[PDB]
């Protein structure tokens, strides 16, 4: 066989043996669950 020996590094296809060194740039943020359950009501005034 060829014995590929893939290295570290995520966020890319299998064609890349290594992408990052000690700190890869790829980062993922959480989906911020229940974001629709927040209304964000504005403020209003009273009759002067």
């Amino acid at each position: 066989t060829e014995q590929l020996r893939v290295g570290p590094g995520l966020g890319v296809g299998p064609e890349v043996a290594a992408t990052g060194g000690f700190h890869q740039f790829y980062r993922q943020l959480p989906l911020n669950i229940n974001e629709y359950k927040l209304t964000q009501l504005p403020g209003r005034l009273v009759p002067g």
């Binding site: 066989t1 014995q3 590929l4 296809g13 064609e15 890349v16 043996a17």
Partner: protein, 189 residues
């Protein structure tokens, strides 16, 4: 996308020599994510075989030659065939040894050979078994009928599907009547 510049800094006072520390981008892709075993070698070696010019229509009836194969006609024609692999992107294919070597003598003063040998691709760090069906005329011309890799000569078919479980018993077909429930719901509107 990284920006590499010149780093404008003041001129050094006493010396002129310093540490450069050139930029480097440590990332290595593969030529294919799955390791090549014999297919790439099969096409590159298949384009080096000769045409129908040998005309060795006869069966030959090759017989084996049990020997340690130190230095004889089998390894000589094997190295002669490996020397024919001189393409632009062709591998080096360092020769190793021969197993299952057969010679056949044709009444028209010909010598056919069925030589299986092992090669070691140094650029890819691995070994392969190649099949060389080559004949030799009386005028020392070595015609190669088929030069490819072993295990690439697959049989006619692979019958069993290779079930994973030992005993699972899949559900049998219903085998309906004259319409098989497809034309029944398709013909009606």
């Amino acid at each position: 996308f990284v920006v590499v510049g010149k780093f404008v800094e003041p001129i050094p006072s006493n010396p002129g020599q310093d540490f450069t520390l050139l930029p480097m981008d440590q990332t290595y892709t593969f030529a294919d994510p799955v390791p090549d075993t014999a297919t790439a070698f099969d096409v590159v070696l298949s384009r080096f075989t000769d045409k129908k010019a040998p005309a060795d229509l006869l069966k030959g009836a090759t017989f084996p030659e049990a020997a340690p194969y130190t230095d004889s006609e089998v390894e000589n024609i094997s190295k002669l065939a490996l020397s024919r692999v001189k393409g632009p992107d062709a591998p080096v294919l360092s020769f190793i040894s021969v197993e299952y070597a057969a010679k056949g003598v044709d009444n028209k003063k010909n010598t056919h050979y069925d030589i299986a040998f092992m090669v070691y691709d140094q650029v890819k760090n691995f070994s392969l078994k190649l099949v060389l069906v080559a004949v030799l005329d009386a005028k020392n011309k070595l015609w190669i009928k088929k030069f490819s890799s072993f295990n690439s000569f697959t049989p006619k078919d692979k019958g069993p599907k290779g079930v994973e479980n030992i005993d699972e018993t899949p559900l049998a077909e219903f085998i309906p009547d004259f319409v098989q429930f497809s034309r029944l719901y398709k013909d009606n509107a």
